Amino acid sequence: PFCPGCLSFGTEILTVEYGPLPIGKIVSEEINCSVYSVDPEGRVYTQAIAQWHDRGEQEVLEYELEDGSVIRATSDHRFLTTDYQLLAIEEIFARQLDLLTLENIKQTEEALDNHRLPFPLLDAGTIKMVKVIGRRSLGVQRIFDIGLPQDHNFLLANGAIAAN
């Protein structure tokens, strides 16, 4: 079936235990690990993955942000905006809204202080508000997703917060 919010194989999730890892690998090997997620209150916390989804193949597009980072996902994949809405990346692009991202993130395990979590996202690190400046199709590619016990969202290695 068509997956509204899926990511490319190579999309790196910032895992707590292992650092940046492609979602394709996490799903292919059903890797048990934790991700950094945001709760309804706006706090970042660690969450263990509950399910792994290989959704087959579908069009994947590369969205480029103002800071040069890229997001390779389905057009309806939601991301956290600066005004704290979870909107489709294509919508964020069409409306020229800003994605709420962290920048200068350590690309290793325990990128954030596990001891201090939960902690407010806007105070967890250097916040970088960026718009989507372009989109280009990558054609039909493999797509993935993961399931979480509480909130279905997680921090990507590039600082963006993917929200299914």
CATH code of the domain covering residue 96: 2.170.16.10
Distances from the Cα of 53 to the Cαs of 1, 13, 42, 70, 111, in angstroms?
Answer: 12, 14, 26, 22, 25
In angstroms, this model's resolution equals 1.5
Q: Which are the contacts of 41, defined by CB distance < 8 A and separation ≥ 6?
A: none
Q: Are 13 and 21 in contact (CB under 8 A)?
A: yes
Domain housing 100: 1-163
At residue 151, φ and ψ (nearest 5 deg) are -100, 130
Q: Which of 82, 102, 90, 104 is nearest to 137 (CA)?
A: 90
C-alpha angle with apex 133: 129 to 138, nearest 5 degrees? 120
Residue owning tokens 């707590």? 16
Cα 132 from Cα 140, distance rounded (Å): 21
Return d(Cα 139, Cα 155) in angstroms, integer: 25
Domains of the chain: total: 1
Contact 43, 29 (CB under 8 A): no
- Residue for token digits 């800003």? 98
Q: d(Cα 137, Cα 30) in Å, to the nearest integer?
A: 28
User: How far is the first Cα of the chain from the last one, in angstroms, to the nearest whole number?
Assistant: 15
